[PDB]
Coordinates of C-alpha atoms and ligand atoms in Angstrom, one line a residue:
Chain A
X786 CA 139.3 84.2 73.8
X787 CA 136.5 82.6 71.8
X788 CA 135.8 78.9 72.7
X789 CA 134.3 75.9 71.6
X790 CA 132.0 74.9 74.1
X791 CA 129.7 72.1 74.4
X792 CA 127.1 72.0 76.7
X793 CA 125.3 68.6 78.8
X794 CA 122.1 69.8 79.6
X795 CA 120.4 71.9 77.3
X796 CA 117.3 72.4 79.9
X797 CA 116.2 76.3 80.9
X798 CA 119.9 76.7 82.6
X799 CA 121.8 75.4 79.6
X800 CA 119.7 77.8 77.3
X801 CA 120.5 80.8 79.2
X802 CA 124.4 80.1 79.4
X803 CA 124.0 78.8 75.7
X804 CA 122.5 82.8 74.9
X805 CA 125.1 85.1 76.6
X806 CA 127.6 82.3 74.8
X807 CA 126.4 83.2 71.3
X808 CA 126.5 86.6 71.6
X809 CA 129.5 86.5 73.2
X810 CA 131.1 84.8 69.7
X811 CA 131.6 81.2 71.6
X812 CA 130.9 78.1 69.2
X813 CA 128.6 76.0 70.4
X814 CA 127.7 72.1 71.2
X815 CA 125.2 70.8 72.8
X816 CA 124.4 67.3 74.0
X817 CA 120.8 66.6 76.0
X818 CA 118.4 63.8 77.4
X819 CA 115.7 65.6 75.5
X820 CA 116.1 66.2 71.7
X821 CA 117.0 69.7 71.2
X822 CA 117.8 69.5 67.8
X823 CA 115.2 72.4 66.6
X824 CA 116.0 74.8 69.0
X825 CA 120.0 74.0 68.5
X826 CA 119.3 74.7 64.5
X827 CA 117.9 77.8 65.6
X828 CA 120.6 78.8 67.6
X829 CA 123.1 78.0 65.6
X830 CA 124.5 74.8 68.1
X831 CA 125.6 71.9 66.9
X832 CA 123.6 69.5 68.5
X833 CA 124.2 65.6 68.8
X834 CA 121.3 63.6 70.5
X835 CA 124.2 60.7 71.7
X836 CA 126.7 61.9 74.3
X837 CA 128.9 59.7 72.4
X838 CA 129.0 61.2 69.5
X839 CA 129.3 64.6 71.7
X840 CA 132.2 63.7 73.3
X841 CA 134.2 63.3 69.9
X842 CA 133.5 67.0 69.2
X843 CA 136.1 69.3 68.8
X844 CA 135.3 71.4 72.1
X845 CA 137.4 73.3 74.4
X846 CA 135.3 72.8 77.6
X847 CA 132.6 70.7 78.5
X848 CA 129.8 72.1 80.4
X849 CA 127.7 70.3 82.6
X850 CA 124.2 72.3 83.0
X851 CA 122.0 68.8 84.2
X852 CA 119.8 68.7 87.3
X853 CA 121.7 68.2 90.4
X854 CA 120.4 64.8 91.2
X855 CA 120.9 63.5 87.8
X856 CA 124.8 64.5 87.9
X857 CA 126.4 61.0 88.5
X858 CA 124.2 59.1 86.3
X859 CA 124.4 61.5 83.7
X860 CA 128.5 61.1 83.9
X861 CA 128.7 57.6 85.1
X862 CA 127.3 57.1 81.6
X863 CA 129.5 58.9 79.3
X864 CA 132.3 57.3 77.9
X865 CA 134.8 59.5 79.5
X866 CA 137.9 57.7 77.4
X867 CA 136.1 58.8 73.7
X868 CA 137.7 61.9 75.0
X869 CA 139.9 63.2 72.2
X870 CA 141.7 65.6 74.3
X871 CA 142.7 66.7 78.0
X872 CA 139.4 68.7 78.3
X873 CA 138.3 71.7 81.1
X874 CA 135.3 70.6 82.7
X875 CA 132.8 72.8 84.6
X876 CA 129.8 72.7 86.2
X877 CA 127.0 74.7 87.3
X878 CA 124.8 73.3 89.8
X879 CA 123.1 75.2 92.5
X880 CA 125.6 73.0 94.9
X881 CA 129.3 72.0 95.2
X882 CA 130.5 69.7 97.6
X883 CA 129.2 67.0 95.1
X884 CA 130.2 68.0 91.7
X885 CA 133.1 68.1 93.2
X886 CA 133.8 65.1 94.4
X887 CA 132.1 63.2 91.7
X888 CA 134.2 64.9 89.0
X889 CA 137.1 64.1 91.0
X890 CA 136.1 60.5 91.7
X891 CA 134.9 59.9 87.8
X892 CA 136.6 62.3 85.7
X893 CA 139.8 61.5 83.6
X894 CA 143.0 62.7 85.8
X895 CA 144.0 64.5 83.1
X896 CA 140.8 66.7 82.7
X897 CA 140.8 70.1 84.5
X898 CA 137.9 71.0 86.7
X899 CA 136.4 74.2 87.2
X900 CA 133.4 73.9 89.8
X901 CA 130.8 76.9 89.6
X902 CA 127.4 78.7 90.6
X903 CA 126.6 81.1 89.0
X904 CA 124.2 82.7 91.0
X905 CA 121.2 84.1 88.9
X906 CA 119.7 82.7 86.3
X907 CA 116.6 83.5 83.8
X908 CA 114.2 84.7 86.2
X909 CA 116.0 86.6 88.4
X910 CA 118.5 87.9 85.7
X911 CA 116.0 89.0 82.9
X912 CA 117.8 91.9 81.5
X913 CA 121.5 91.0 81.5
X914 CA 124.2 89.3 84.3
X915 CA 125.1 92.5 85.1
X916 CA 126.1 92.8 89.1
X917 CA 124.8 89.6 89.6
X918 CA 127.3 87.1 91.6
X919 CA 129.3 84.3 89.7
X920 CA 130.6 81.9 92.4
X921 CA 133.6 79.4 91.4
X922 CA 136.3 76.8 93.1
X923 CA 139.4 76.1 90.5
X924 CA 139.3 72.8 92.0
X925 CA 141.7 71.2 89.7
X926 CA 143.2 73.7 86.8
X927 CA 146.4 73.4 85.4
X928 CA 145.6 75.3 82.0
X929 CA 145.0 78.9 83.0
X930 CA 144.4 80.4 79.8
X931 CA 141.4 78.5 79.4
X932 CA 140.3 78.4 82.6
X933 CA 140.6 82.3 82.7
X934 CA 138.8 82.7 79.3
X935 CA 135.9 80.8 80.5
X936 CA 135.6 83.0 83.9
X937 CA 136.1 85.8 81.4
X938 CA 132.8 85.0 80.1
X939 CA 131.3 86.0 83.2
X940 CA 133.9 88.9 83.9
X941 CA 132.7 90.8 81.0
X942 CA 129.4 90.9 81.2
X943 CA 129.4 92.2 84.7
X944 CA 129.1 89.2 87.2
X945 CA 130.3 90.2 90.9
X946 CA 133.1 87.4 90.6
X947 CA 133.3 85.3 94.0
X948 CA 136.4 83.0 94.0
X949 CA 135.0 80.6 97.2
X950 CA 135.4 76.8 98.0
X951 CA 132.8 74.4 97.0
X952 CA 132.5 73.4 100.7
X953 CA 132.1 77.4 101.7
X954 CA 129.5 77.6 99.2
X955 CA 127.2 75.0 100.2
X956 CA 128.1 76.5 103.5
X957 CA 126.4 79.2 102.8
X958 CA 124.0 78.4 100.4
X959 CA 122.3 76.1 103.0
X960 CA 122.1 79.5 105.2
X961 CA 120.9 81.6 101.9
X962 CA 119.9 79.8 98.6
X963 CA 118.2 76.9 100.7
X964 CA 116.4 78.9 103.1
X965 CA 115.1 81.6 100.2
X966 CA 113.7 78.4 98.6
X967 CA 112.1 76.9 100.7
X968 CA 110.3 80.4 101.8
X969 CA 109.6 80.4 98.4
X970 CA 108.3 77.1 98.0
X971 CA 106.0 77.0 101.2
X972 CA 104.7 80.3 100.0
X973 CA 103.4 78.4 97.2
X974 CA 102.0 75.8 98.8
X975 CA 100.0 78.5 101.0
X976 CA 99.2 79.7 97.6
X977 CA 99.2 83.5 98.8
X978 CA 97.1 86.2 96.8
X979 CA 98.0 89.5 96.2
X980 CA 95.4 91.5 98.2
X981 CA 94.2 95.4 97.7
X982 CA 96.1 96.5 100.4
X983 CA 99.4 94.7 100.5
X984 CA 102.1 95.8 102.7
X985 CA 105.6 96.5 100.7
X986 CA 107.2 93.5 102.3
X987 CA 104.1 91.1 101.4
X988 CA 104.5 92.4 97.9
X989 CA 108.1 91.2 97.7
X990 CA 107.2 87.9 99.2
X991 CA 104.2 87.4 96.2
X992 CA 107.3 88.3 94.2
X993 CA 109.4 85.2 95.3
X994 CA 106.7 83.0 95.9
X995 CA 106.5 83.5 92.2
X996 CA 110.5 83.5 91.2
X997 CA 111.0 80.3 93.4
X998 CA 108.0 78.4 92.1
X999 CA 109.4 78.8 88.3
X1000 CA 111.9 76.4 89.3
X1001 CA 111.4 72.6 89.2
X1002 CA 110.8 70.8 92.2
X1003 CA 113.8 68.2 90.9
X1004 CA 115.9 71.7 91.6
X1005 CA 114.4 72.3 95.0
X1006 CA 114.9 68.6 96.1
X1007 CA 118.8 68.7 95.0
X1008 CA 119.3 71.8 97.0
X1009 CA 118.3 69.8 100.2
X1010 CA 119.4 66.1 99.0
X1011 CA 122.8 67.2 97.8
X1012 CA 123.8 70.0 100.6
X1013 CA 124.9 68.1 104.0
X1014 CA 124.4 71.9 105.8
X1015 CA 121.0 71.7 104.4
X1016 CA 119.5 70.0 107.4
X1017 CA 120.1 72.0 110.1
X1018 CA 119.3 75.1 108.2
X1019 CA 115.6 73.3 107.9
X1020 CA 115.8 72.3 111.5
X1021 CA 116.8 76.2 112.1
X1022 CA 113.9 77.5 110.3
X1023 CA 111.2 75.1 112.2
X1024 CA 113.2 75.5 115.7
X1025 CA 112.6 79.8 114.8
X1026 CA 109.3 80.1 114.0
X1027 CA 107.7 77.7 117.1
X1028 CA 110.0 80.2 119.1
X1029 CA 107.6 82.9 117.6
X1030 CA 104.9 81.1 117.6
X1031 CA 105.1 80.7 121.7
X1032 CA 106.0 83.9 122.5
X1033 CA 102.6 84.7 120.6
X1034 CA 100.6 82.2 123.0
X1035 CA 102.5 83.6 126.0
X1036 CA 101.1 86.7 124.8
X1037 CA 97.3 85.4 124.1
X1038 CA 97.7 84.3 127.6
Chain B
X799 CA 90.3 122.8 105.1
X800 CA 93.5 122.8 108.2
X801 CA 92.5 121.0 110.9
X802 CA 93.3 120.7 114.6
X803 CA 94.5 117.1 114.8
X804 CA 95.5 115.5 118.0
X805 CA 97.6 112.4 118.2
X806 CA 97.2 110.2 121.2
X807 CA 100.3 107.8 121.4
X808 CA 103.4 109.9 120.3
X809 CA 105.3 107.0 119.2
X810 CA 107.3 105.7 116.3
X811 CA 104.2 105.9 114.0
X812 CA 102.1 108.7 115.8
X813 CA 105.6 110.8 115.1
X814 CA 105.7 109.6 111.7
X815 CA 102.1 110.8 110.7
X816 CA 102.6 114.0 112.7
X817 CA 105.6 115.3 110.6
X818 CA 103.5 114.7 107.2
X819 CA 100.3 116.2 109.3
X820 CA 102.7 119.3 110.2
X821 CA 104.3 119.8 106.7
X822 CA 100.6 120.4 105.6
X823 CA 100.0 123.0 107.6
X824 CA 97.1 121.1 110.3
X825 CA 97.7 122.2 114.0
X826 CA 99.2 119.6 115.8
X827 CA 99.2 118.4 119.0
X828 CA 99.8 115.3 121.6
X829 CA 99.6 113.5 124.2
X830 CA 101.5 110.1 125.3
X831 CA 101.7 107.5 128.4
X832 CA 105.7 109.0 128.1
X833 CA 106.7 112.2 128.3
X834 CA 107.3 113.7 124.8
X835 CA 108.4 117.2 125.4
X836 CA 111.5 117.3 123.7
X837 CA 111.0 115.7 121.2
X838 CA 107.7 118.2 121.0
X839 CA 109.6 121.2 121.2
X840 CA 111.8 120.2 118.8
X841 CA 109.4 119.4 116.6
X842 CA 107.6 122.4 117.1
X843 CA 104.2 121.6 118.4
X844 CA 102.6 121.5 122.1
X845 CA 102.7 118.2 124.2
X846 CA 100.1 117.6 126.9
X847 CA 101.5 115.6 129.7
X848 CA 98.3 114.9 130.7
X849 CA 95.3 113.4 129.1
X850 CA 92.6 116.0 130.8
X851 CA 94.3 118.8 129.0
X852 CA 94.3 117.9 125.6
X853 CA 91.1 116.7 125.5
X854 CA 89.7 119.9 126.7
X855 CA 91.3 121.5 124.0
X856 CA 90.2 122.7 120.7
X857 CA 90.5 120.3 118.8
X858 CA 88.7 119.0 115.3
X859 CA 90.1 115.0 115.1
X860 CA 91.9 112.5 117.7
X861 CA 94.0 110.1 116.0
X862 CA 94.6 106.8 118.2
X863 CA 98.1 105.5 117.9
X864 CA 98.6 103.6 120.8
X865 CA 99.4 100.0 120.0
X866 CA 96.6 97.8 119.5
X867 CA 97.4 96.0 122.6
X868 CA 96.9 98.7 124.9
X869 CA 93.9 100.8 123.1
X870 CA 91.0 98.9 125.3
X871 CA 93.4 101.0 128.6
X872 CA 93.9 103.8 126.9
X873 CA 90.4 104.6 125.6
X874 CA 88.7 103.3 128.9
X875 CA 91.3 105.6 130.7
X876 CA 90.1 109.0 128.8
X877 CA 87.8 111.6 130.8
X878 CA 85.9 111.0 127.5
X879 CA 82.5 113.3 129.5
X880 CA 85.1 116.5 128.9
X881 CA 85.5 116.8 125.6
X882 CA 83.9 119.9 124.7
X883 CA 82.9 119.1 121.2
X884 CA 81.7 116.1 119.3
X885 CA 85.2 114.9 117.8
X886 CA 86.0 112.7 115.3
X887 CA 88.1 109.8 116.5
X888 CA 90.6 107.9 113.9
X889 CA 92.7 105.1 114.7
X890 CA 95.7 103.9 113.2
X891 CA 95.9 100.5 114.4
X892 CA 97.0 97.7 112.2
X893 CA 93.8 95.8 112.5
X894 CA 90.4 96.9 112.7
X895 CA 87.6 94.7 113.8
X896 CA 88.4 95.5 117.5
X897 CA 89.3 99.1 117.3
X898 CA 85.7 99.6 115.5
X899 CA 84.2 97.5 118.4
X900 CA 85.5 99.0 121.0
X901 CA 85.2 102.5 120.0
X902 CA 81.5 102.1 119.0
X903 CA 81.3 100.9 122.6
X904 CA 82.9 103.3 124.9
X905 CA 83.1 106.4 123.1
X906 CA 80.4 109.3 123.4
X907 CA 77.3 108.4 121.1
X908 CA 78.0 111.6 119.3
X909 CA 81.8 111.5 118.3
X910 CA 82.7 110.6 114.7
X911 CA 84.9 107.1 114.0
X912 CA 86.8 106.7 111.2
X913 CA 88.8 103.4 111.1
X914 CA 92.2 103.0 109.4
X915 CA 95.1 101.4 108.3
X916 CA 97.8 102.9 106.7
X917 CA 99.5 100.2 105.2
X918 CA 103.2 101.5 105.6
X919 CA 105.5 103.2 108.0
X920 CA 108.7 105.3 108.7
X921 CA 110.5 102.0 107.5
X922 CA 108.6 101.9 104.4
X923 CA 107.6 105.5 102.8
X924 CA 110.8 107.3 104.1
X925 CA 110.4 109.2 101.2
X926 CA 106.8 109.6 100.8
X927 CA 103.8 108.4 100.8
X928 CA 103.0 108.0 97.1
X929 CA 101.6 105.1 96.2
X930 CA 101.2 103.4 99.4
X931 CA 98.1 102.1 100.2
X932 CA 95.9 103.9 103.3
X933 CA 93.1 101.7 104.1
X934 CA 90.0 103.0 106.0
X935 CA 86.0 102.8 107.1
X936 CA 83.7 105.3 107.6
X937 CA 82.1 103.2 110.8
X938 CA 80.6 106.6 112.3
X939 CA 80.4 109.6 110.2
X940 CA 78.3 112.7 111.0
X941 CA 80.7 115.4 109.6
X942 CA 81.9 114.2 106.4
X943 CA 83.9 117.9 105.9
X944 CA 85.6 117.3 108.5
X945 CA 85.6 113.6 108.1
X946 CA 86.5 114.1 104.1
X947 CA 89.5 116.9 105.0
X948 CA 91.4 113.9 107.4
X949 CA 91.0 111.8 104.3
X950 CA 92.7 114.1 101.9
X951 CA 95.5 114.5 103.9
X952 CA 96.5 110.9 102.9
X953 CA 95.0 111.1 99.1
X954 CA 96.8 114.4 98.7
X955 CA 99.9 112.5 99.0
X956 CA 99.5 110.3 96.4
X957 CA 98.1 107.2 98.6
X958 CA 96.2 104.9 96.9
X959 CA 93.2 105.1 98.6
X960 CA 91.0 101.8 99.5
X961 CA 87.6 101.8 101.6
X962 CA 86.7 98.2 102.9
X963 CA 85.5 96.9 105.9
X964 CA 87.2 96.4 108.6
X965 CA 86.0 92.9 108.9
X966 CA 88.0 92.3 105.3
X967 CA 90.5 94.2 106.3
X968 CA 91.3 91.9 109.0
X969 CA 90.8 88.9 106.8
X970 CA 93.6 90.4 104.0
X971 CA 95.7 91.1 106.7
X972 CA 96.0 88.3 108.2
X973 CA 96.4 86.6 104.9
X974 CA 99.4 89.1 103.8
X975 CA 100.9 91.7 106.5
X976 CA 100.4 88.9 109.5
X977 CA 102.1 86.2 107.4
X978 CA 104.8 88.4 106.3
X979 CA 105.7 89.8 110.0
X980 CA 105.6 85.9 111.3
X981 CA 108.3 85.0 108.4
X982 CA 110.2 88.2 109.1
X983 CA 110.5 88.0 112.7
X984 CA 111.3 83.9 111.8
X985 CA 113.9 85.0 110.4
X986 CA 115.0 87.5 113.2
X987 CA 115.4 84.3 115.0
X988 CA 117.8 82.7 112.8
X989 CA 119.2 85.7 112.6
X990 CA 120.1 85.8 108.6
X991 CA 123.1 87.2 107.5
X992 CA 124.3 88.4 104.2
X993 CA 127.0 86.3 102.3
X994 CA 129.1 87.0 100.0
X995 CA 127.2 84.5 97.4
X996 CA 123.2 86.1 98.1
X997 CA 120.9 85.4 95.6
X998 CA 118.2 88.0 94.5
X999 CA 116.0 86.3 96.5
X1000 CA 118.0 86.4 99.2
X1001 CA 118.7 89.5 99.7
X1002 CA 115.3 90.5 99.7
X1003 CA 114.7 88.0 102.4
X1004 CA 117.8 89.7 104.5
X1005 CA 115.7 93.4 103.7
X1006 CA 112.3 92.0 104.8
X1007 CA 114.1 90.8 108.4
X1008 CA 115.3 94.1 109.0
X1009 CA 112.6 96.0 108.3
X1010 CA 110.4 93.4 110.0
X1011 CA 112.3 93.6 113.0
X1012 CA 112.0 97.2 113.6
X1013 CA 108.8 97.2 114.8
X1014 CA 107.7 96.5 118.5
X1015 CA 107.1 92.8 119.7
X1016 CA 104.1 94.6 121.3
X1017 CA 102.7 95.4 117.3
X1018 CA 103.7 92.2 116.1
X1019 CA 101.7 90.4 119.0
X1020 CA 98.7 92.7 118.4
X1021 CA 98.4 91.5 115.2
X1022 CA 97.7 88.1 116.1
X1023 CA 96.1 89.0 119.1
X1024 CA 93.3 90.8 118.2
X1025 CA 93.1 89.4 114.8
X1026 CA 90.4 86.6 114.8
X1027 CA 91.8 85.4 111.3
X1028 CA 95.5 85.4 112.5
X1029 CA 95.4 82.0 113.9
X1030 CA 94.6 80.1 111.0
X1031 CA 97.0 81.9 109.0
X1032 CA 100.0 81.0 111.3
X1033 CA 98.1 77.2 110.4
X1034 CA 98.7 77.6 107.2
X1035 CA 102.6 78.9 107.0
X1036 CA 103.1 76.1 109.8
X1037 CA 101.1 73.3 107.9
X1038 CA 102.7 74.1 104.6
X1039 CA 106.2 74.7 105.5
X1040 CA 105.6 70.8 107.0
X1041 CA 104.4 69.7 103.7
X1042 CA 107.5 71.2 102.5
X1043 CA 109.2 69.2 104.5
X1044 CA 107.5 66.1 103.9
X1045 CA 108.1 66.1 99.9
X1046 CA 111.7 66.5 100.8
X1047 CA 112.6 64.0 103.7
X1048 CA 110.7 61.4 101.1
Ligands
NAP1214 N1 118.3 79.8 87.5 C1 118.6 78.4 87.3 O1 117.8 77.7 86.8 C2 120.0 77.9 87.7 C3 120.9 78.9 88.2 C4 122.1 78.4 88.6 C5 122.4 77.0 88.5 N2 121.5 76.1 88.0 C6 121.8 74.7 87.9 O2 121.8 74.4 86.5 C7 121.4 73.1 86.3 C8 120.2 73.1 85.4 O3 119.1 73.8 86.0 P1 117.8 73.9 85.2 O4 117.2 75.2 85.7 O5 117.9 73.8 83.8 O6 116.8 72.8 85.7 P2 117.0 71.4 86.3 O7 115.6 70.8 86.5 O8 117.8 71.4 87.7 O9 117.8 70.5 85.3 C9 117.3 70.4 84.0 C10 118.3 69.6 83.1 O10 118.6 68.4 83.7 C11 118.4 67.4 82.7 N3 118.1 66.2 83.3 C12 117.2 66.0 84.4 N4 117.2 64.7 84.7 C13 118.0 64.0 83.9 C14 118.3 62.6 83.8 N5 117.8 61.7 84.6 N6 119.2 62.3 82.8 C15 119.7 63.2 82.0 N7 119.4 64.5 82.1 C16 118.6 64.9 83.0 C17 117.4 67.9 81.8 O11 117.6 67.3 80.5 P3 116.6 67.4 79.3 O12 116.2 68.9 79.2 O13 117.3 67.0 78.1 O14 115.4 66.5 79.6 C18 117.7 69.3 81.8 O15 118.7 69.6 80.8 C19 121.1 72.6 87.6 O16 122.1 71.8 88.2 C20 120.8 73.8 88.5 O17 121.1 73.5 89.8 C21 120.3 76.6 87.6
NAP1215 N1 104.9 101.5 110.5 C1 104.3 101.5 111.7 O1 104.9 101.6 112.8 C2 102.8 101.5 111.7 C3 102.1 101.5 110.5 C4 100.7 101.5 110.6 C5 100.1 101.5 111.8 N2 100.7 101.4 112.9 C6 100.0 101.4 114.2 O2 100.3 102.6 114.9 C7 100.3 102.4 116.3 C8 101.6 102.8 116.8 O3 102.6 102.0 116.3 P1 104.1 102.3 116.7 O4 104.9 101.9 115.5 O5 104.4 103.7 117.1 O6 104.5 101.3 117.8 P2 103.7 100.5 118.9 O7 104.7 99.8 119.8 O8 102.6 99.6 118.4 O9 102.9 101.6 119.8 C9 103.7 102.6 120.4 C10 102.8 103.6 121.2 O10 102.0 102.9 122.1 C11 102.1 103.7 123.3 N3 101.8 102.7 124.3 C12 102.2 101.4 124.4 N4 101.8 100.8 125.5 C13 101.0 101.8 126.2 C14 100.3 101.8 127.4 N5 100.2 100.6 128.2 N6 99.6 102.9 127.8 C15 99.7 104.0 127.1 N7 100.4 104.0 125.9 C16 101.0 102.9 125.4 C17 103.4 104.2 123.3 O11 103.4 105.3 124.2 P3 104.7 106.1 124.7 O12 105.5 106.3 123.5 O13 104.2 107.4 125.2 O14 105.4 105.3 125.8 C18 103.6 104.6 121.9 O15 103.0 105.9 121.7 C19 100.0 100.9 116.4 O16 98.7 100.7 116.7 C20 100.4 100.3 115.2 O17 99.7 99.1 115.0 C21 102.1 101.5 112.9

């Protein structure tokens, strides 16, 4: 069950997967906007600043750990035929509805696709993956055994393994994820202060305030841009707290 | 060092101080708008149906756990003139400029106030009080054995203890346990659910609803109420979450 894999992205999320990879016994690749080559010698990747180049690699799945709203020019730009081989590709962006169709729409037919969120990453799983939840659609698989050695990786180190459609998960992502960030993100605006005598729940909220905030706003912005439930979970959010907020001025009066 | 401690307002939180109170070995009693025999008897101390009897009672401190919307009713209701002791009064309320206003106002010159705020509740120290925080002000304080034995009974329990004003008090709240309630009870509203995808930060989210939500509209609106710093806070969370918006419908 060891694999080659070769990663598109080597940003914070990459590096995480790439970790748990190397441990695991994986052998790595890893292809990036940015030059990685340094940290890849460190790790042990073999790193190739050309996707090119990358995409002649003997590798048994491709990856693809970029930002959600550089997806389709990241893969509109790879030469898809310098693929030497029928290839699994997976994702892991924070949504699903458009991975999906973009892999479907620009991807070689030939080329499995295994769509997923995993859903933790380095600040919120800091000591290990470990009943944290691994979301995934097998949205076009015809091997198995490498399909199901991949997932493995997750398996074994303890993810809560959620089998869901990439529809269902935006679904309720826009209800979860979406809302959580945003709390998170409005919280930092507000800038809050811990404060010498914080309430339990305002502690936890200092907490996400700063969990949220560790992730880029180019994250934040794909969560909304790229989730059509999105919307009306915003709308939801607004429409609930004026429906506080007058209740509190029928009070005042 | 056991004291004779009366609660006034035998309610979620007057019951939840009063079983810590008991387990101490203080003589309790109460007294309540509703009738709390039962749950007096079963609980083993006296109820007082009405206000004239317990106040002529001995008795060392009144605690005040009414909410903060009714104490102005409540305090100008009490036959204050037969109490036959100067008394120390402590209130519970969760914010303090206008409980130490109005008790320096209509309370008898020579009764004892203490103002406080303990900063958790039967949702939040089921299992003790260690380490929560118990905020108070010594606003009127002629006895301080008596006044320093109602103190220990939170510091004995491992509380962290913090003396401020009840003018900063009011300002922190409304910057902290104010905003928190108004996203809590926001997200009563929506009514969140658990999915079978939650992140961390979700699910703490889905906690902070549920706990929110167990307190009384009535506490939630006394907070803002009778908070002077509330308003713009609710500014802030409304203003922000709109600049939220903004950078994302761009
Ligand atoms: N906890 C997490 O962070 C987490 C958890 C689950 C899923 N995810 C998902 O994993 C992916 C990566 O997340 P992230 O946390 O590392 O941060 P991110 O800001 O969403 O994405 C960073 C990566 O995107 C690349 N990138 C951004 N714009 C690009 C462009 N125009 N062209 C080519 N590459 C571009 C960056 O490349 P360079 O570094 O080379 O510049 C970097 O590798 C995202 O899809 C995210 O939704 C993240
Ligand atoms: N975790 C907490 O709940 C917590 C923590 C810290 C401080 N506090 C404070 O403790 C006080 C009590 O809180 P709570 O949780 O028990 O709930 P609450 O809804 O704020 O207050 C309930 C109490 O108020 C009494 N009351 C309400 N309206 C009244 C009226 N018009 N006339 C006379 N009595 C009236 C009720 O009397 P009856 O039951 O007899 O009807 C009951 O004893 C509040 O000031 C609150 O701010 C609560």
């Amino acid at each position: 069950q060891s694999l080659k894999i070769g990663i598109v992205g080597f940003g914070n999320f990459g590096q995480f997967l790439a970790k748990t990879m190397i441990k695991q016994g994986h052998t790595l690749t890893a292809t990036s906007r940015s030059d990685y080559s340094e940290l890849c010698l460190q790790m042990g990747i073999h790193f190739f600043r050309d996707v090119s180049a990358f995409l002649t690699a003997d590798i048994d799945v491709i990856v693809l750990c970029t930002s959600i709203l550089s997806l389709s020019e990241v893969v509109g730009s790879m030469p898809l035929t310098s693929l030497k081989r029928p290839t699994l590709f997976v994702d892991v962006l924070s949504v699903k509805e458009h991975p999906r169709e973009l892999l479907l729409r620009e991807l070689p037919e030939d080329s499995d696709i295994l769509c997923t969120h995993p859903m933790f990453g380095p600040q919120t799983a800091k000591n290990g993956w470990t009943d944290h939840t691994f979301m995934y659609d097998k949205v076009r698989i015809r091997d198995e055994v490498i399909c199901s050695n991949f997932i493995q990786i997750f398996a074994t180190e303890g993810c809560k393994m959620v089998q869901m459609s990439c529809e269902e998960h935006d679904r309720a992502a826009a209800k979860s994820q979406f809302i959580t960030h945003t709390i998170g993100r409005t919280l930092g605006e507000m800038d809050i202060q811990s404060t010498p005598i914080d309430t339990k729940g305002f502690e936890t909220l200092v907490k996400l305030k700063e969990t949220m905030m560790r992730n880029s706003f180019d994250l934040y912005s794909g969560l909304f841009v790229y989730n059509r439930f999105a919307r009306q979970e915003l709308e939801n959010l607004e429409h609930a707290l004026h429906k506080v907020k007058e209740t509190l001025m029928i009070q005042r009066t």
